[PDB]
Design an enzyme around this catalytic site. Structure first.
Site, PDB file in Angstrom:
ATOM      1  CD  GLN A   2      -2.966   1.373   2.133  1.00 54.41           C
ATOM      2  OE1 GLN A   2      -2.911   1.707   3.329  1.00 54.41           O
ATOM      3  NE2 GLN A   2      -4.151   1.001   1.643  1.00 54.41           N
ATOM      4  CG  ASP A  32     -15.073  14.381 -10.816  1.00 49.44           C
ATOM      5  OD1 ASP A  32     -14.675  14.235 -11.992  1.00 49.44           O
ATOM      6  OD2 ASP A  32     -14.319  14.941  -9.973  1.00 49.44           O
ATOM      7  CG  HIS A  63     -11.282  14.915 -13.334  1.00 49.20           C
ATOM      8  ND1 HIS A  63     -12.324  15.356 -12.543  1.00 49.20           N
ATOM      9  CD2 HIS A  63     -10.248  15.851 -13.296  1.00 49.20           C
ATOM     10  CE1 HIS A  63     -11.916  16.478 -12.014  1.00 49.20           C
ATOM     11  NE2 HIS A  63     -10.684  16.840 -12.431  1.00 49.20           N
ATOM     12  CG  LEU A  74     -11.667   0.589   0.252  1.00 49.45           C
ATOM     13  CD1 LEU A  74     -12.168  -0.691  -0.335  1.00 49.45           C
ATOM     14  CD2 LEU A  74     -12.541   0.981   1.446  1.00 49.45           C
ATOM     15  CG  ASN A  76      -6.896  -2.031   0.895  1.00 48.59           C
ATOM     16  OD1 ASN A  76      -5.834  -1.412   0.660  1.00 48.59           O
ATOM     17  ND2 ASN A  76      -7.872  -2.215   0.038  1.00 48.59           N
ATOM     18  CG  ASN A 154      -6.573  23.504 -12.189  1.00 50.92           C
ATOM     19  OD1 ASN A 154      -6.183  23.587 -11.006  1.00 50.92           O
ATOM     20  ND2 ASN A 154      -7.467  22.572 -12.524  1.00 50.92           N
ATOM     21  CE1 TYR A 170     -22.500  32.194  -7.625  1.00 49.22           C
ATOM     22  CE2 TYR A 170     -22.275  29.836  -7.953  1.00 49.22           C
ATOM     23  CZ  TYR A 170     -22.698  31.060  -8.411  1.00 49.22           C
ATOM     24  OH  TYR A 170     -23.302  31.106  -9.625  1.00 49.22           O
ATOM     25  CB  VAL A 173     -18.582  27.065  -2.541  1.00 48.11           C
ATOM     26  CG1 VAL A 173     -17.849  25.752  -2.902  1.00 48.11           C
ATOM     27  CG2 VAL A 173     -20.017  26.990  -3.020  1.00 48.11           C
ATOM     28  CB  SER A 220      -9.501  18.483 -10.070  1.00 52.46           C
ATOM     29  OG  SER A 220     -10.233  19.118 -11.063  1.00 52.46           O
TER      30      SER A 220
HETATM   31 CA   LIG Z   1     -15.973  30.817  -1.814  1.00 52.01          CA
HETATM   32 CA   LIG Z   2      -5.670   0.779  -0.314  1.00 54.48          CA
END
Ligand SMILES: [Ca+2]
Ligand SMILES: [Ca+2]
Length: 274
Positions: A2, A32, A63, A74, A76, A154, A170, A173, A220
């Site tokens: 991992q 997305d 993406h 996960l 793991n 970007n 906004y 956000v 992103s």
């Molecule tokens: Ca804002």
């Molecule tokens: Ca994993």
């Protein structure tokens, strides 16, 4: 076997995971390109699709899978590890195969997420213009107690110009900019008065369509680190309200320089989840 993306340790999600808070029982929607539901390193619980001819559980771009992976790969013995590995993950497809969408599709995903009790909404997308409907949708969600995070853009910086897009701009956000493994601002990162926080967005390794892993650059990649940090804070303090989680992210961030280029600075989740 991992891999632990430099990003996890940089925002100190690793210190928080060690105390036993991993986002269990927190619902995160990823607006997305969809998510490759069958990837072994992800657990997608449901979602919806607002794009004609494509269901929500396939990603023909990559993406969406990548973003989903930064929030929740996960814990793991394979692939990578997410910021909030134990969250309940929803995939809401608002963008097409080529990576772009319509405002009504987006507004539909945002409202879907409010009606279905999502705690956190991630938006790693943005446009030059918003809309009255988009604005209504994000104000209400946040007013209904959801934490809304979007990528700032970007677009880089150019003169005194604000290059933050919608819906990041906004004030309901959280607009997120990107930094590199050295905690330096990436060249591509948008600038402007609405920039709030910074997170890892240069050379981010995460899950990728057809059961593999890949490195990508962008705000992103940065936004998801904050959606995930939001979820950690909530698994630790269920009692918190949306503006309480938000305010914790910005108050305890590491100062890196002028707010026009870095918002309040780099997020630190250990400090924020105190
Ligand atoms: Ca804002
Ligand atoms: Ca994993």
């Amino acid at each position: 076997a991992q891999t632990v993306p430099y990003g996890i340790p940089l925002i100190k999600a690793d210190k928080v995971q060690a105390q036993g808070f991993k986002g269990a029982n927190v619902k995160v929607a990823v607006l997305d390109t969809g998510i490759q539901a069958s990837h072994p390193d992800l657990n997608v619980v449901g979602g919806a699709s607002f794009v004609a001819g494509e269901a929500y559980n396939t990603d023909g771009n990559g993406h969406g899978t990548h973003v989903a992976g930064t929030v929740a790969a996960l814990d793991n013995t394979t692939g990578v590890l997410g910021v909030a590995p134990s969250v309940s993950l929803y995939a809401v497809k608002v963008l097409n195969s080529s990576g772009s969408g319509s405002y009504s599709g987006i507004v539909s995903g945002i409202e879907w997420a409010t009606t279905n009790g999502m705690d956190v909404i991630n938006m790693s997308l943005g446009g030059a213009s918003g809309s009255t409907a988009m604005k209504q949708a994000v104000d209400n969600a946040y007013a209904r107690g959801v934490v809304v995070v979007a990528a700032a853009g970007n677009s880089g910086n150019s003169g005194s110009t604000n290059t933050i897009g919608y819906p990041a701009k906004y004030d309901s956000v959280i607009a997120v900019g990107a930094v590199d493994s050295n905690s330096n601002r990436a060249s591509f990162s948008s600038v402007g008065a609405e920039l709030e926080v910074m997170a890892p967005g240069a050379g981010v390794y995460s899950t990728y369509p057809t059961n593999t892993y890949a490195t990508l650059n962008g705000t992103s990649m940065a936004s998801p680190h904050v959606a995930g940090a939001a979820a950690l804070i909530l698994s630790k303090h269920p009692n918190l309200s949306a503006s309480q989680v938000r305010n914790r992210l910005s108050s305890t961030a590491t100062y890196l320089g002028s707010s026009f280029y870095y918002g309040k600075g780099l997020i630190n989740v250990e400090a924020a989840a105190q």
